């Protein structure tokens, strides 16, 4: 299949990226040097992720050496919970461009449907340990992310981590000026998601897949967690066709009609990840993975959960 997705803002999104999160800034110049170099032309980044300038260092060099034209990339980032005010949202998605290199982003995601008290903590936190609020709500940050596109900043915006009644929440906006064009969510063979990513289609909203391989480096990962990579049912289906087990988790959500963004920084994996192109998970293999749904998240957080718009 085809390698991009057409937007409900006209624009096409390459079906599959490099995430990075959790590349170590010292890794990750090279990491998307490589990815670049191998045909990666999407890369899903975070302010939040504190390695966004590392990132810039490797985009700018490889348009510097006319690898790629700025017009085939695609650059991702989010909009961090602390910066949920009227007065912030530029000056954050300015910092993610500067640190970037870049005039404009193809997509700028509000990266959880939860606003955090501003300051210099990413996750300001009450004597108790929960998090401080913003009173901020999310339709007045969506108005805020229309203002980029208006701008010039983005070319398009999005939602992340946003559940069926926030998604609607945001398409019934009175006086909604540009619809999300992409909720990013977690997604995987544990974690199907097969009514909310209905919902998003089915509005135009194209989904993208975080975390398909099921994050085996998240820092709170625990012994006893299920593994996607290990998991000998999947690696049936992986030897069947001749790949690796990562390579059908990535194919997975490609034949969802998702976006899907595995993270590594390891060349042989960057490489590895992008040979996806040229096979074809059978309709019976696809329900078969869809099958291993346990409602198992790698992202949640438990110093949120009683924030009023924590989204699970
Ligand atoms: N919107 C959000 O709230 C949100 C949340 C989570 C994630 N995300 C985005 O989604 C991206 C992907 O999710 P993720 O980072 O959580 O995890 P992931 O992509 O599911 O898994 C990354 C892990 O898998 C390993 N790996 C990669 N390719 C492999 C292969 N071919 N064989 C074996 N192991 C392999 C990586 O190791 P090495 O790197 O050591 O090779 C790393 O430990 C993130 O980086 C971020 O960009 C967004
Ligand atoms: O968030 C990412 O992209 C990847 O994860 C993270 C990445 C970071 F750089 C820092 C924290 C997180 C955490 S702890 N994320 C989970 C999380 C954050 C906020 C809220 Br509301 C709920 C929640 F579940």
Request: glycine content about 6%; aromatic content about 8%; hydrophobic content about 40%.
């Amino acid at each position: 299949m085809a390698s991009r997705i057409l937007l409900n803002n006209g624009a096409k999104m390459p079906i599959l990226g490099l995430g990075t999160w959790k590349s170590p800034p010292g890794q990750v110049t090279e990491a998307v040097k490589v990815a670049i170099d191998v045909g990666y032309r999407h890369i899903d980044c975070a302010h939040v992720y504190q390695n966004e300038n590392e990132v810039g260092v490797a985009i700018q060099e490889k348009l510097r050496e006319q690898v790629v034209k700025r017009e085939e990339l695609f650059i991702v980032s989010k909009l961090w919970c602390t910066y949920h005010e009227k007065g912030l949202v530029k000056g954050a998605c300015q910092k993610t461009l500067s640190d970037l290199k870049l005039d404009y982003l193809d997509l700028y995601l509000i990266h959880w449907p939860v606003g955090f008290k501003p300051g210099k903590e990413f996750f300001p936190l009450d004597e108790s340990g929960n998090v401080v609020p913003s009173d901020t709500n999310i339709l007045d940050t969506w108005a805020a992310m229309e203002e980029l596109v208006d701008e010039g900043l983005v070319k398009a915006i999005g939602i992340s981590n946003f559940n069926h009644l926030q998604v609607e929440m945001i398409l019934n906006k009175p006086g909604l000026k540009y619809k999300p064009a992409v909720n990013q969510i977690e997604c995987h063979p544990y974690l199907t998601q097969e009514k909310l990513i209905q919902y998003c289609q089915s509005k135009g909203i194209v989904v993208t897949a975080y975390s398909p391989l099921g994050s085996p480096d998240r820092p709170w990962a625990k012994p006893e967690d299920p593994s996607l990579l290990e998991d000998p049912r999947i690696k049936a289906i992986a030897a069947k066709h001749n790949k690796t087990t990562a390579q059908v988790l990535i194919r997975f959500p490609m034949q969802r009609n998702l976006v899907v963004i595995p993270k590594s920084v390891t060349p042989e994996r960057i490489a590895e990840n992008f040979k996806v192109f040229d096979f074809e998970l059978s309709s019976q293999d696809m329900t078969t993975l869809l099958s291993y749904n346990r409602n198992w998240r790698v992202c949640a957080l438990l110093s949120c959960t009683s924030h009023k718009d924590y989204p699970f």
